[PDB]
Amino acid sequence: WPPRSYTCSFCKREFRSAQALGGHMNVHRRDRARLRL
Ligand SMILES: [Cd+2]
């Protein structure tokens, strides 16, 4: 978890937001889409 960027844990993806991550983590629910992993 860097200063100018944060992780969702579930997508282990670094983002440049705060509230967008909180919301983006709550949007998590299965894959149900493409993407190899
Ligand atoms: Cd996420």
Q: How far is ligand 1, taken at its centre, from the CA of residue 25, in Å?
A: 5
CA–CA distance, 5 with 15 (Å, rounded to integer): 5
Instruction: Return phi, psi of residue 22, to 5°.
Output: -50, -50
Q: Which residues lie closer than 8 Å to 7 by C-beta, 6 or more apart?
A: 1, 13, 14, 15, 21
Q: How far is ligand 1, taken at its centre, from the CA of residue 5, in Å?
A: 12
CA–CA distance, 12 with 14 (Å, rounded to integer): 7
Neighbours of 29 (CB within 10 A): 7
Q: How far is ligand 1, taken at its centre, from the CA of residue 27, in Å?
A: 8
CB 7 within 8 A of CB 13: yes
Solving technique: NMR
CA–CA distance, 6 with 14 (Å, rounded to integer): 5
CA–CA distance, 20 with 36 (Å, rounded to integer): 24
CA–CA distance, 5 with 13 (Å, rounded to integer): 9
Q: How far is ligand 1, taken at its centre, from the CA of residue 26, in Å?
A: 8
Residue type, 25: M
Q: How far is ligand 1, taken at its centre, from the CA of residue 16, in Å?
A: 12
Instruction: Give the single-character DSSP code of 4.
Output: T
